[PDB]
Design an enzyme around this catalytic site. Structure first.
Site, PDB file in Angstrom:
ATOM      1  N   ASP A 180       0.468  -1.282  -0.261  1.00 52.44           N
ATOM      2  CA  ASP A 180      -0.500  -0.021  -0.055  1.00 52.44           C
ATOM      3  C   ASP A 180       0.708   1.350  -0.012  1.00 52.44           C
ATOM      4  OD1 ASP A 180      -2.470   1.316  -0.151  1.00 52.44           O
ATOM      5  OD2 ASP A 180      -3.060   1.417   1.761  1.00 52.44           O
ATOM      6  N   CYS A 214      -8.294  -1.843  -4.437  1.00 55.54           N
ATOM      7  CA  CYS A 214      -6.936  -2.915  -3.342  1.00 55.54           C
ATOM      8  C   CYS A 214      -8.205  -2.359  -2.686  1.00 55.54           C
ATOM      9  CB  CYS A 214      -5.482  -1.583  -3.176  1.00 55.54           C
ATOM     10  SG  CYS A 214      -6.353  -0.531  -4.255  1.00 55.54           S
ATOM     11  N   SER A 215      -7.353  -1.517  -1.308  1.00 56.78           N
ATOM     12  CA  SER A 215      -8.282  -0.897  -0.101  1.00 56.78           C
ATOM     13  C   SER A 215      -9.335  -0.164  -0.580  1.00 56.78           C
ATOM     14  CB  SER A 215      -7.111  -0.822   1.446  1.00 56.78           C
ATOM     15  OG  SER A 215      -8.285  -1.238   2.067  1.00 56.78           O
ATOM     16  N   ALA A 216      -8.599   1.055  -0.965  1.00 52.58           N
ATOM     17  CA  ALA A 216      -9.374   2.461  -1.226  1.00 52.58           C
ATOM     18  C   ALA A 216      -9.789   2.132  -2.956  1.00 52.58           C
ATOM     19  CB  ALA A 216      -8.445   3.976  -1.041  1.00 52.58           C
ATOM     20  N   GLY A 217      -9.307   1.248  -3.362  1.00 48.90           N
ATOM     21  CA  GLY A 217      -9.515   1.221  -5.424  1.00 48.90           C
ATOM     22  C   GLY A 217      -9.124   3.015  -5.646  1.00 48.90           C
ATOM     23  N   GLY A 219      -5.217   4.157  -5.582  1.00 44.11           N
ATOM     24  CA  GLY A 219      -3.674   3.760  -5.891  1.00 44.11           C
ATOM     25  C   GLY A 219      -3.263   2.685  -6.701  1.00 44.11           C
ATOM     26  N   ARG A 220      -3.334   1.906  -6.488  1.00 44.83           N
ATOM     27  CA  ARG A 220      -2.339   0.952  -7.362  1.00 44.83           C
ATOM     28  C   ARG A 220      -3.565   0.268  -7.809  1.00 44.83           C
ATOM     29  NH1 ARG A 220      -1.645  -3.112  -1.601  1.00 44.83           N
ATOM     30  NH2 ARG A 220      -3.253  -1.705  -1.421  1.00 44.83           N
TER      31      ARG A 220
HETATM   32  O1  VO4 Z   1      -5.663   0.259  -1.493  1.00 48.94           O
HETATM   33  V1  VO4 Z   1      -5.096   1.672  -2.187  1.00 48.94           V
HETATM   34  O2  VO4 Z   1      -4.670   2.849  -1.186  1.00 48.94           O
HETATM   35  O3  VO4 Z   1      -3.616   1.169  -3.659  1.00 48.94           O
HETATM   36  O4  VO4 Z   1      -6.084   2.880  -3.612  1.00 48.94           O
END
Ligand code: VO4
Ligand code: VO4
EC number: 3.1.3.48
Length: 297
Positions: A180, A214-217, A219-220
């Site tokens: 993350d 991903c967690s937030a959807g 970044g990655r």
């Molecule tokens: O779960 V992310 O902080 O890569 O959007």
């Protein structure tokens, strides 16, 4: 070219400034449905919401809200659904969305536990004999098989609409070594994984949009989609020079906020696209080189 610009940003060490300029120019649209009181427990992060204009609506009359955005890339002719890591109470909604949108693939770029915290509910079954029923959305989910590599796992799932008894095969592509707010370990590892998803059919237009999370959807998930779309645009023209990465990322950010969360993710995006260009422009052998260099065994 992107390679010249890439070297013009490294020299001056201005990746932080370039990336900040992306943040300043990025679209700002309302997320009023996401912020409704009744939806507080459907959002994983206060500051990551789907825009109203591009959000995925569930086909239920009770509450159609899910934290998920349709990223529709007109020129590239590819769509993606970017969503947050499902919450313990939104795993039924998540698979309802997969069903209603006719997706064939789910790309998961995070681990359930990262840096000692739970980032994502365990929304798919880990054992063949222990299937999952989501009572709220009337869906059944069975693990059919698993193919574990060194840094990613591919699972075949069977999703069943219990109301109609129809069944679909869902492919689950799980990148397990992407931190993350971090970057993949190499261009080769990332591209080997992206081409694995591509080769499965999951991104093809006869299916619904791939679901990426991903967690937030953002970044990655944004890094993955940006690389794929840039490579696809380059493919349609065989013209690496016509692809403007920053412009593609700003176009994507019209459909979901925050895509690509660090300047080094932006920089990695350039690396991935530059390297992937070798395949697009005619060097098929580079795909085997990525697989070797990625050490998936
Ligand atoms: O779960 V992310 O902080 O890569 O959007
Ligand atoms: O709500 V839209 O007309 O931008 O798909």
């Amino acid at each position: 070219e992107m390679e010249k610009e890439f070297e013009q940003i490294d020299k001056s060490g201005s990746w932080a400034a370039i990336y900040q300029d992306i943040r300043h120019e990025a679209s700002d649209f309302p997320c009023r449905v996401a912020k409704l009181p009744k939806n507080k427990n459907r959002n994983r992060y206060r500051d990551v919401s789907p825009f109203d204009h591009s959000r995925i609506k569930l086909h239920q009359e009770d509450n159609d809200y899910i934290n998920a955005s349709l990223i529709k890339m007109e020129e590239a002719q590819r769509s993606y659904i970017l969503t947050q890591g499902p919450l313990p109470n939104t795993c039924g909604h998540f698979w309802e969305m997969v069903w209603e949108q006719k997706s064939r693939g789910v790309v998961m770029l995070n681990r359930v536990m990262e840096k000692g915290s739970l980032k994502c509910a365990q929304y798919w079954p880990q054992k063949e004999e222990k299937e999952m029923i989501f009572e709220d959305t009337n869906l059944k989910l069975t693990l059919i098989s698993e193919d574990i590599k060194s840094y990613y796992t591919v699972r075949q799932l069977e999703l069943e609409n219990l109301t109609t008894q129809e069944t679909r095969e869902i492919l689950h592509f799980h990148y397990t070594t992407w931190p993350d707010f971090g970057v993949p370990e190499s261009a080769a590892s990332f591209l080997n994984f992206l081409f694995k998803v591509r080769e499965s059919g999951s991104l093809s237009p006869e299916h619904g949009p791939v679901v990426v999370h991903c967690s937030a959807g953002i970044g990655r998930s944004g890094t993955f989609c940006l690389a794929d779309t840039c490579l696809l645009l380059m493919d349609k023209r065989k013209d690496p020079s016509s692809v403007d990465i920053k412009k593609v990322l700003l176009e994507m950010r019209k459909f979901r906020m925050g895509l690509i969360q660090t300047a080094d993710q932006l920089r990695f995006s350039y690396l991935a696209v530059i390297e992937g260009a070798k395949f697009i422009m005619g060097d098929s052998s580079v795909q085997d080189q990525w697989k070797e260099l990625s050490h998936e065994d």
